[PDB]
Design a protein around this ligand. Structure first.
Ligand SMILES: CC(C)CCC[C@@H](C)[C@H]1CC[C@H]2[C@@H]3CC=C4C[C@@H](OC(=O)CCC(=O)O)CC[C@]4(C)[C@H]3CC[C@]12C
Ligand SMILES: CC(C)CCC[C@@H](C)[C@H]1CC[C@H]2[C@@H]3CC=C4C[C@@H](OC(=O)CCC(=O)O)CC[C@]4(C)[C@H]3CC[C@]12C
Ligand SMILES: CC(C)CCC[C@@H](C)[C@H]1CC[C@H]2[C@@H]3CC=C4C[C@@H](OC(=O)CCC(=O)O)CC[C@]4(C)[C@H]3CC[C@]12C
Ligand SMILES: CC(C)CCC[C@@H](C)[C@H]1CC[C@H]2[C@@H]3CC=C4C[C@@H](OC(=O)CCC(=O)O)CC[C@]4(C)[C@H]3CC[C@]12C
Ligand SMILES: CC(C)CCC[C@@H](C)[C@H]1CC[C@H]2[C@@H]3CC=C4C[C@@H](OC(=O)CCC(=O)O)CC[C@]4(C)[C@H]3CC[C@]12C
Ligand SMILES: CC(C)CCC[C@@H](C)[C@H]1CC[C@H]2[C@@H]3CC=C4C[C@@H](OC(=O)CCC(=O)O)CC[C@]4(C)[C@H]3CC[C@]12C
Ligand SMILES: CC(C)CCC[C@@H](C)[C@H]1CC[C@H]2[C@@H]3CC=C4C[C@@H](OC(=O)CCC(=O)O)CC[C@]4(C)[C@H]3CC[C@]12C
Ligand SMILES: CC(C)CCC[C@@H](C)[C@H]1CC[C@H]2[C@@H]3CC=C4C[C@@H](OC(=O)CCC(=O)O)CC[C@]4(C)[C@H]3CC[C@]12C
Ligand SMILES: CC(C)CCC[C@@H](C)[C@H]1CC[C@H]2[C@@H]3CC=C4C[C@@H](OC(=O)CCC(=O)O)CC[C@]4(C)[C@H]3CC[C@]12C
Ligand SMILES: CC(C)CCC[C@@H](C)[C@H]1CC[C@H]2[C@@H]3CC=C4C[C@@H](OC(=O)CCC(=O)O)CC[C@]4(C)[C@H]3CC[C@]12C
Ligand SMILES: CCC1(c2ccccc2)C(=O)NCNC1=O
Lengths: 1061, 96, 71
């Protein structure tokens, strides 16, 4: 309803001057068909012809918006219409296509090249195409080009055509107010009126009142183009949108249009095409034969006059006037860019168009760079703006770098980095804060994270809209997403002191780290993959990015956001994990020991962590299951011991017979010192042996296997009123193990007690342990009383012995074959449960039927429920109770009891039950176990290889002494804690600076090898080779066909030369 | 649903037999136990809604055909051994 | 649903139809088999018309030799 209330229209209310034909008025309509002010006396009214047009016929169905407007309307209102009501963004480029209103045909190669050029120029820059609207001539060629565009590209090219309202066929068909009106693409050849072009996108059909006459749209279109060109482009460097003027063929008026375009402030470049004919060919013949612009000699002047008088069929004075207008155009010869088919005329429309725009702007190279950045054309920027000898202002390249970064342009960042811009001299704290507060580019979930950490830090709420996100809030976001004891460098006291004192000290030492984190946080994946390649500490960056993307995916799923965001974040996490795995593959292929040093060295820029710890914290199963991480974990397992031959037996001999330790080959003092926080040789050997993780594990295991026998002895033999010696040892073991489990609750990773318990309860073998220690406490308290509680305590002791044998199964979990076997059993428990459910239904059906038939007269008692489950359950395991299947009764053999009614049904349903159970369900569970064996086996192997790290870190953090003697070490820790009060969980390496530089150079070599190898593998694949061969063969065939045309021309010229001589 | 209606007609027959006096009451009880067998299998169909139990139930229904063919071959071997054993170990038997 | 929602659903369906058909055209044109077939046909046409170019080059060389002999 705004469109009618804002736009106006005019209708023919005149005195009906006949002139030539009595029916035809001044407006040309019929004399009875009625219902500027000079001779038409037109009246102004709200519009009645606007809405949407459904183009019926003509192949593809396309919907085009349309309005009928007055020819004298202000262009600002129309610009507001396109920007608001039609939801069209402001274009980065305006194209004005002008040409002859008469229909014409061009060469096929010229038409194909012009169409592909116009489509690609409207596609890459996101431009607007301005045509004559109706389906005549050059607009018909533009429509054929758009038909080809809708045949091979997913563009919606905005192609607003401006046509006279009085000259379009079926004017009554387009009458409505926000009403979809069907239109016919058929054009009657008898009618002088022409239909609109079928595949235009919008229409600014303009009525001056008259019908069947042109000239109602030229002034409005020129004013709208000027008003668009006065609008500033989004780069905000001080330039409006560029306007080009494409000319194909044309007549007399297009020379005046070229004169109006060239003699304008600001000037508008004009691109013409050759081979169409008429005004474009005379413009080309002038442009080649011009010398110094307007300095044209007499012979080509007369040639231009005779070609104007011949091709256009004018008189001598009209040709002289057209040549005067041509010379007035040709004074500004620099703006006119002439495209020539074939030859060296850029071999393309778009290089000519964009080069003409660049030198029609005629501004500094920052302005051309911002224009190329807006058009997203890295190629034209490389081939024109960054040519040799190009002068550059100081500080403009860094501003262009900032503009390319905020708009998410990967190739422009690559081009600027390759053209001298360095990240170390560019990235500052304020520039990074501006990058973190940008609003261009794709969407992100960073504002939700900042709001959540602000709500958690200061319980306020929603952030203000004009909130500048500081780097400290970003550090809180990284601390929250990383989890654990992570501490970002932003939140440390040095960075907060630098932030308070300032808002090369403000420059970042590792700017690609910050750019990687910022690119991951705002979900810019290609820029993150670019920033992964450049800079050091690549594997740490990949693992940090993997954990950050996984945490952001989990937070996006938890906050009920769009699920596609969570899927894309999980894909980014998997891509970064695959990158870390491939980098580990390359490092393992090059040098094993340097790969270990890469995996273990402390990352000062990542909260003093380790690459192994970062991979484990991201649950990266494929990283730890890699051979380098596995043999690294093996080296961590042995501690300071070389050994590595006939494992288990040597450390058992060391534990049982301590003089065997002295004969063991120990490692060097600085071979691989994995540390947590940075007679004498015999004591050093004893301390190095007894603190090894394998020695501690075998000491704990041999104490467990001597505890279990003592528990077996105290449950098999009778007990007196007071416990024996072996029972006191078992009680001491249980109490010290319970104290050890509370100590594992206290010395955990979090800081608040509920989080400590919640982290500890993830290991299910520890909460089952604590449950079976509470059960032992209940059993001991019951046993230490008198009868009948002592036997109850004994009964609890036997259920404890069942649990401790299953704990021995978990202890078998360390072995490389027994461990995957145990988790394989744990995976088949679910299929076992489903088999139990189906067997339970069949089992109670048979049990209830048997008990209800064979025992008719029964009182309510719990023995009925026992008899339901008793014999049918043992019937599965080969005990059919053959004496009770069908006993003889109702006869004399002694008088038997009489036959129960329907007692013959019990063997029949017994037969059906035994068949269904033993043959169907057991064999089906065999099939279920068999066909899911391979996936479960591979998953269990990989999960065991992942959990080797948890086992190794747990048994390295354990006390040296086994649980029955662990009270001495517990009092040692209590005394040390009290002494420290009265006066970093991991195994890092803490290498020196030269070793750090060697490790970093090894990492850069590995990164270059991995990336380039991938480029070599891509270039040597069959698919890429076949694609390159097909494209080269296509280009060769079509340019070769041009060679054939030139060979025919050369043969004709040689024949003519031979005929002449 | 047709097995449901069959086991409702069977329940009607069992109730009509049970509401009389002896010996029909025990016959109604015997029909009630076959009904309890059917209603446990109807519980299996109710488990059919669950995403894992449902495919498991139709998987069992698919292996019933292979089970039937195994039953046929076992039936041939089983009556061959049973007839041979009973005919050897009991030579003098009346028709019964 | 209402009429505007019906029009939105219909336009979504046309977008999906164009996407599915065209994607299928793009997948067909980018397959190895279609690329190999197009390359083989173009190479065949190029060899035989190129052989015609060779015959014309021999004729042009003969004409140039005759013109050089005449002058
Ligand atoms: C390191 C691992 C692989 C083995 C360590 C455990 C064994 C050395 C322990 C566990 C169970 C113990 C037995 C538990 C019970 C008894 C009964 C005990 O006899 C009595 O208490 C009554 C008679 C007497 O006083 O001698 C003599 C020791 C003995 C055989 C113990 C001998 C040492 C055993 C075999
Ligand atoms: C640390 C634990 C978990 C495993 C280590 C095993 C040994 C250090 C233990 C296990 C069984 C113990 C034995 C269990 C029972 C006895 C009987 C006991 O006999 C008496 O005291 C006799 C006189 C009396 O009955 O009072 C002497 C100690 C002895 C041999 C114990 C000695 C120490 C043994 C071998
Ligand atoms: C004396 C009688 C009562 C026999 C005892 C039977 C159960 C109490 C035991 C026998 C086998 C045990 C299972 C053996 C293997 C495993 C895998 C293991 O789980 C894992 O390693 C975690 C990973 C995974 O589940 O795959 C420990 C639990 C579980 C299911 C055990 C649970 C307890 C089970 C069923
Ligand atoms: C479908 C399958 C996989 C599981 C279903 C079987 C169990 C749930 C059943 C089969 C055997 C049953 C047991 C058989 C006998 C007894 C003894 C009964 O104790 C007595 O009768 C007291 C002593 C006496 O009176 O003799 C208590 C129930 C219990 C443990 C039953 C509990 C339920 C059990 C374990
Ligand atoms: C879908 C499937 C899983 C259903 C299986 C249900 C049965 C196994 C349960 C449900 C109702 C139970 C009955 C509910 C009530 C009683 C009365 C109860 O009587 C007494 O305890 C005696 C009363 C007294 O003297 O105090 C004996 C068990 C019994 C028969 C229960 C036996 C087991 C039953 C049949
Ligand atoms: C659902 C699947 C995965 C697990 C199987 C669970 C049930 C089938 C079990 C678990 C608890 C069992 C009950 C535990 C205790 C008893 C009491 C028991 O009572 C007696 O034996 C009374 C003594 C007598 O008179 O003989 C009869 C069996 C019953 C009902 C058990 C029947 C079978 C139950 C319901
Ligand atoms: C107490 C005694 C007599 C045991 C009872 C044995 C049979 C009467 C039961 C035991 C398992 C039952 C089967 C379990 C599973 C299925 C699949 C289910 O069929 C479907 O879901 C239809 C699709 C398909 O058949 O695959 C119901 C019928 C059937 C064959 C059941 C038919 C009746 C069976 C053979
Ligand atoms: C090849 C397999 C898969 C199927 C073949 C086995 C069944 C067809 C057989 C095996 C056990 C047989 C049952 C064994 C015993 C009896 C009891 C019998 O009743 C009496 O003898 C009356 C009571 C008495 O005299 O003790 C009626 C036949 C019946 C149900 C039999 C019917 C046929 C059954 C179910
Ligand atoms: C009552 C007792 C003694 C049981 C009788 C046991 C055997 C004498 C029967 C039982 C199953 C029979 C077999 C069932 C199936 C076949 C396949 C059939 O052979 C073919 O169809 C030929 C093609 C081929 O061998 O694959 C006939 C022989 C054979 C081996 C049969 C040979 C005789 C067997 C071993
Ligand atoms: C190919 C396979 C499936 C054939 C298996 C056939 C047998 C299982 C059948 C067929 C003939 C039957 C016999 C046919 C006749 C009689 C007489 C019948 O005698 C009476 O009923 C008593 C007569 C009276 O006193 O009224 C007892 C069963 C018996 C032996 C039948 C027992 C079962 C037999 C041997
Ligand atoms: C009780 C079993 C055990 C143990 C022993 C050997 C291997 C793994 C676990 C222990 O003795 N103390 C520490 N933690 C434990 O649960």
């Amino acid at each position: 309803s705004w469109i009618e209330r804002a736009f106006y229209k005019r209708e023919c209310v005149h005195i009906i001057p006949s002139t030539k034909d009595p029916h035809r008025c001044c407006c040309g309509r019929l004399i009875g068909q009625h219902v500027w002010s000079i001779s038409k006396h037109t009246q102004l009214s709200p519009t009645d012809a606007f809405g949407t047009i459904e183009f019926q016929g003509g192949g593809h169905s396309n919907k085009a918006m349309y309005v009928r407007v007055s020819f004298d309307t202000k262009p600002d209102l129309l610009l507001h219409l396109m920007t608001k009501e039609w939801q069209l963004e402001l274009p980065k480029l305006l194209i004005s296509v002008h040409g002859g209103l008469q229909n014409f045909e061009l060469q096929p190669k010229l038409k194909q090249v012009f169409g592909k050029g116009l489509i690609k120029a409207a596609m890459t820059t996101g431009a607007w195409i301005f045509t004559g609207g109706v389906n005549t001539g050059v607009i018909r060629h533009v429509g054929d080009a758009l038909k080809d565009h809708a045949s091979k590209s997913r563009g919606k090219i905005c192609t607003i055509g401006i046509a006279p309202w009085g000259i379009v066929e079926n004017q009554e068909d387009l009458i409505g107010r926000d009403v979809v009106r069907p239109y016919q693409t058929m054009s009657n050849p008898m009618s002088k009126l022409t239909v609109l072009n079928s595949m235009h996108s919008h229409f600014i059909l303009a009525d001056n009142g008259t019908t069947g006459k042109y000239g109602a749209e030229v002034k409005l279109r020129r004013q709208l183009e000027k008003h668009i060109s006065l609008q500033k482009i989004n780069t905000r460097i001080g330039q409006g949108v560029p306007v080009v003027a494409l000319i194909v063929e044309g007549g007399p008026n297009v020379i005046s249009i070229v004169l109006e375009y060239l003699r304008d402030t600001p000037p508008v470049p004009v691109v013409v095409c050759d081979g169409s004919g008429r005004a474009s060919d005379i413009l080309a013949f002038g442009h080649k034969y011009s010398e110094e612009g307007g300095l044209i000699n007499e012979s080509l002047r007369d040639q231009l006059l005779v070609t104007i008088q011949k091709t256009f069929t004018y008189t001598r004075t009209q040709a002289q006037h057209l040549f005067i207008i041509l010379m007035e155009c040709m004074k500004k010869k620099e703006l006119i860019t002439v495209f020539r088919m074939g030859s060296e005329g850029h071999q393309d429309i778009d290089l000519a168009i964009l080069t003409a725009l660049l030198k029609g702007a005629n501004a500094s190279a920052p302005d051309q760079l911002s224009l190329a950045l807006a058009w997203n054309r890295v190629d034209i920027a490389r081939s024109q703006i960054f040519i040799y000898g190009q002068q550059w202002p100081v500080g403009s390249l860094e501003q262009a770098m900032l503009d390319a970064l905020v708009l998410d342009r990967v190739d422009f960042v690559k081009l600027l980095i390759e053209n001298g811009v360095s990240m170390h001299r560019f990235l500052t704290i304020s520039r990074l804060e501006e990058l973190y507060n940008t609003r261009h580019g794709p969407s992100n979930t960073l504002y939700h994270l900042v709001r959540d950490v602000k709500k958690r830090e200061y319980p306020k709420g929603n952030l203000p809209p004009d909130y500048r996100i500081s780097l400290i809030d970003i550090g809180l976001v990284i601390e929250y997403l990383m989890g654990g004891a992570y501490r970002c460098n932003y939140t440390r006291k040095r960075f907060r002191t630098l932030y308070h004192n300032l808002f090369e000290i403000n420059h970042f030492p590792f700017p690609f780290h910050e750019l990687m984190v910022w690119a991951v946080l705002m979900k810019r994946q290609k820029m993150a993959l670019f920033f992964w390649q450049h800079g050091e500490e690549a594997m740490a960056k990949a693992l940090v990015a993997c954990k950050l993307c996984k945490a952001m995916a989990h937070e996006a799923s938890e906050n009920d956001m769009v699920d596609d965001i969570s899927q894309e974040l999980n894909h980014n996490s998997r891509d970064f994990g695959q990158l870390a795995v491939e980098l580990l593959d390359q490092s393992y292929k090059q040098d094993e020991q340097l790969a270990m040093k890469l995996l273990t060295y402390e990352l000062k820029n990542w909260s003093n962590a380790t690459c192994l710890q970062l991979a484990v914290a991201a649950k990266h199963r494929d990283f730890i299951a890699h051979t380098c991480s596995q043999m690294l974990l093996t080296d961590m397992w042995m501690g300071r011991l070389r050994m590595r031959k006939n494992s288990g037996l040597k450390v058992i001999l060391g534990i049982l017979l301590p003089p065997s330790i002295l004969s063991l080959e120990f490692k060097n003092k600085d071979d691989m010192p994995y540390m947590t926080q940075a007679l004498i040789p015999l004591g050093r050997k004893i301390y190095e042996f007894y603190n090894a993780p394998i020695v501690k594990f075998w000491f704990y295991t041999l104490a467990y296997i001597g505890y279990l026998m003592l528990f077996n002895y105290i449950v098999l033999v009778k007990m007196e009123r007071w416990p024996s010696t072996q029972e006191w040892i078992v009680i001491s073991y249980i109490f010290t193990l319970g104290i050890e489990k509370m100590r594992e609750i206290l010395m955990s990773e979090p800081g608040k007690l509920l989080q400590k318990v919640k982290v500890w309860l993830q290991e299910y073998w520890n909460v089952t342990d604590l449950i079976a220690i509470l059960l032992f406490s209940v059993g001991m308290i019951l046993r230490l009383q008198d009868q009948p509680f002592r036997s109850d305590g004994r009964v609890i002791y036997c259920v404890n012995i069942i649990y401790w044998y299953i704990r021995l199964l978990d202890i078998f979990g360390v072995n490389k074959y027994l461990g995957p076997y145990v988790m394989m059993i744990g995976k088949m428990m679910i299929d076992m449960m489903y088999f139990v459910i189906i067997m339970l239904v069949v089992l109670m059906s048979f049990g209830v039927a048997r008990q209800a038939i064979l025992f008719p007269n029964e009182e309510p008692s719990w023995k009925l429920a026992k008899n339901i489950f008793y014999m049918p359950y043992w019937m599965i395991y080969g005990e059919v109770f053959a004496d009770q299947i069908d006993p003889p009764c109702g006869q004399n053999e002694i008088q038997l009891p009489p036959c129960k009614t329907g007692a013959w049904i019990v063997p029949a349903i017994m037969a059906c039950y035994l068949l269904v159970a033993n043959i169907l369900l057991v064999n089906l569970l065999i099939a279920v176990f068999n066909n899911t064996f391979f996936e479960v086996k591979s998953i269990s192997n990989q999960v065991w290889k992942f959990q080797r790290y948890q086992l190794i870190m747990t048994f390295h953090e354990r006390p040296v002494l086994p649980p029955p003697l662990i009270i001495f070490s517990h009092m040692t820790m209590i005394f040390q804690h009290l002494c420290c009060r009265w006066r970093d969980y991991g195994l890092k390496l803490f290498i020196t600076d030269d070793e750090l530089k060697k490790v970093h150079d090894f990492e850069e070599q590995c990164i270059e090898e991995y990336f380039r190898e991938k480029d070599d593998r891509f270039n040597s694949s069959n698919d890429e080779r076949i694609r390159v061969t097909s494209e080269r063969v296509e280009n060769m065939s079509m340019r070769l066909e041009e060679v054939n045309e030139r060979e025919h021309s050369m043969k004709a010229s040689l024949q003519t030369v031979d005929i002449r001589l």
